[PDB]
Structures are given as structure tokens and as C-alpha cells.
Amino acid sequence: LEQTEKEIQMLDRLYSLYVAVITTIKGYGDYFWVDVVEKIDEMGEQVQQ
């Protein structure tokens, strides 16, 4: 069988991309009052996001 291969990829690749998008948002979200309140890492948020 060959069709279900492409059928699987066409959805799975970009669903993986969009969960990876969630990954960075949550990774930054863990950052503290120390990490966020500081103006030296607020610039980090625009950089990373």
C-alpha cells in the first residue's frame, strides 16, 4: 500500500509543527517573576516567540 503513507504524512507533519509551536510558548511560560519581571529577559520573549 502507498496512498495511506502520504495521507498520514500530510496531516502528521504539520500537526507536529503546531504542537512544537505550543512547546516554546509553554517553555517560556514556566519562567518566574525573577525571569519575566526582569527587563533583560522580556526581550527574550519577543526573540523566542
Short mmCIF file of N, CA and C in Angstrom, two decimals:
data_model
loop_
_atom_site.label_atom_id
_atom_site.label_comp_id
_atom_site.label_asym_id
_atom_site.label_seq_id
_atom_site.Cartn_x
_atom_site.Cartn_y
_atom_site.Cartn_z
N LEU A 1 0.83 -1.20 0.00
CA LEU A 1 0.00 0.00 0.00
C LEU A 1 0.87 1.25 0.00
N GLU A 2 0.41 2.29 -0.69
CA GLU A 2 1.20 3.51 -0.85
C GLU A 2 0.44 4.77 -0.48
N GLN A 3 -0.89 4.78 -0.64
CA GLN A 3 -1.65 6.03 -0.51
C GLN A 3 -1.69 6.51 0.94
N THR A 4 -1.96 5.59 1.88
CA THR A 4 -2.09 5.97 3.28
C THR A 4 -0.80 6.57 3.83
N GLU A 5 0.34 6.25 3.23
CA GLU A 5 1.60 6.88 3.61
C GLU A 5 1.52 8.39 3.47
N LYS A 6 1.29 8.87 2.25
CA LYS A 6 1.16 10.30 2.01
C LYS A 6 -0.02 10.88 2.79
N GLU A 7 -1.12 10.11 2.88
CA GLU A 7 -2.27 10.57 3.66
C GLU A 7 -1.89 10.80 5.12
N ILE A 8 -1.05 9.93 5.68
CA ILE A 8 -0.62 10.11 7.06
C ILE A 8 0.30 11.32 7.18
N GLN A 9 1.30 11.42 6.29
CA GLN A 9 2.28 12.50 6.41
C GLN A 9 1.63 13.87 6.30
N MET A 10 0.73 14.05 5.32
CA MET A 10 0.21 15.38 5.02
C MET A 10 -0.44 16.02 6.24
N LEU A 11 -0.97 15.21 7.15
CA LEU A 11 -1.54 15.75 8.38
C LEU A 11 -0.53 15.74 9.52
N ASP A 12 0.21 14.63 9.66
CA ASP A 12 1.05 14.44 10.83
C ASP A 12 2.17 15.46 10.90
N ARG A 13 2.80 15.76 9.76
CA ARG A 13 3.95 16.66 9.79
C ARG A 13 3.57 18.02 10.37
N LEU A 14 2.45 18.59 9.90
CA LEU A 14 2.09 19.94 10.32
C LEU A 14 1.37 19.95 11.66
N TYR A 15 0.70 18.86 12.03
CA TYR A 15 0.23 18.78 13.41
C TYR A 15 1.40 18.74 14.39
N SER A 16 2.48 18.05 14.01
CA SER A 16 3.71 18.08 14.81
C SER A 16 4.30 19.48 14.85
N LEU A 17 4.30 20.19 13.72
CA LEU A 17 4.77 21.57 13.73
C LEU A 17 3.97 22.42 14.71
N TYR A 18 2.65 22.28 14.71
CA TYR A 18 1.84 23.10 15.60
C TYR A 18 1.93 22.70 17.07
N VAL A 19 2.18 21.43 17.39
CA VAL A 19 2.45 21.11 18.79
C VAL A 19 3.83 21.64 19.19
N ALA A 20 4.79 21.63 18.26
CA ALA A 20 6.08 22.26 18.52
C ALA A 20 5.93 23.75 18.78
N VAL A 21 4.99 24.40 18.10
CA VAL A 21 4.68 25.80 18.39
C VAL A 21 4.25 25.96 19.85
N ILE A 22 3.41 25.04 20.33
CA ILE A 22 2.96 25.06 21.72
C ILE A 22 4.14 24.86 22.66
N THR A 23 5.12 24.05 22.24
CA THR A 23 6.25 23.72 23.11
C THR A 23 6.98 24.98 23.58
N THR A 24 7.33 25.87 22.64
CA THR A 24 8.10 27.06 23.00
C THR A 24 7.29 27.99 23.90
N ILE A 25 6.00 28.15 23.59
CA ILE A 25 5.14 29.02 24.40
C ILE A 25 5.11 28.52 25.84
N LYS A 26 4.90 27.22 26.02
CA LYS A 26 4.87 26.67 27.37
C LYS A 26 6.24 26.73 28.04
N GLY A 27 7.30 26.47 27.28
CA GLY A 27 8.64 26.57 27.83
C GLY A 27 8.96 27.94 28.37
N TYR A 28 8.59 28.99 27.64
CA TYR A 28 8.75 30.33 28.19
C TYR A 28 7.78 30.59 29.34
N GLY A 29 6.58 30.01 29.28
CA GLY A 29 5.57 30.23 30.30
C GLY A 29 5.99 29.81 31.70
N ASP A 30 6.97 28.91 31.82
CA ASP A 30 7.40 28.44 33.13
C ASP A 30 8.23 29.46 33.88
N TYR A 31 8.55 30.59 33.26
CA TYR A 31 9.56 31.48 33.81
C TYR A 31 8.98 32.38 34.90
N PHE A 32 9.82 32.67 35.90
CA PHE A 32 9.37 33.19 37.18
C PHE A 32 9.10 34.70 37.12
N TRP A 33 8.73 35.24 38.28
CA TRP A 33 8.80 36.68 38.49
C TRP A 33 10.22 37.19 38.28
N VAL A 34 11.21 36.45 38.77
CA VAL A 34 12.60 36.82 38.50
C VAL A 34 12.87 36.81 37.00
N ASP A 35 12.39 35.77 36.31
CA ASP A 35 12.72 35.60 34.90
C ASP A 35 11.96 36.57 34.01
N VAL A 36 10.70 36.86 34.33
CA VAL A 36 9.87 37.68 33.46
C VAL A 36 9.93 39.15 33.85
N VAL A 37 9.80 39.44 35.15
CA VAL A 37 9.79 40.82 35.62
C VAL A 37 11.06 41.56 35.21
N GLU A 38 12.19 40.86 35.17
CA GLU A 38 13.42 41.48 34.69
C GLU A 38 13.26 41.91 33.24
N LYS A 39 13.68 43.14 32.95
CA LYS A 39 13.65 43.64 31.58
C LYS A 39 14.71 43.00 30.69
N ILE A 40 15.67 42.28 31.28
CA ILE A 40 16.73 41.65 30.49
C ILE A 40 16.25 40.38 29.81
N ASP A 41 15.15 39.79 30.27
CA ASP A 41 14.60 38.59 29.63
C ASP A 41 13.21 38.80 29.06
N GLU A 42 12.59 39.98 29.24
CA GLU A 42 11.41 40.28 28.45
C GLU A 42 11.78 40.35 26.97
N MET A 43 12.96 40.89 26.68
CA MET A 43 13.47 40.88 25.31
C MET A 43 13.59 39.45 24.80
N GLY A 44 13.91 38.52 25.70
CA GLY A 44 13.93 37.12 25.33
C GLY A 44 12.59 36.63 24.82
N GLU A 45 11.49 37.16 25.37
CA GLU A 45 10.18 36.70 24.93
C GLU A 45 9.90 37.08 23.48
N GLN A 46 10.14 38.35 23.12
CA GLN A 46 9.98 38.68 21.70
C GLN A 46 10.95 37.88 20.84
N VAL A 47 12.20 37.72 21.27
CA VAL A 47 13.14 36.94 20.46
C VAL A 47 12.59 35.53 20.20
N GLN A 48 12.28 34.80 21.27
CA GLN A 48 11.92 33.39 21.13
C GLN A 48 10.55 33.23 20.47
N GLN A 49 9.54 33.95 20.95
CA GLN A 49 8.20 33.81 20.38
C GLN A 49 8.16 34.31 18.95
#
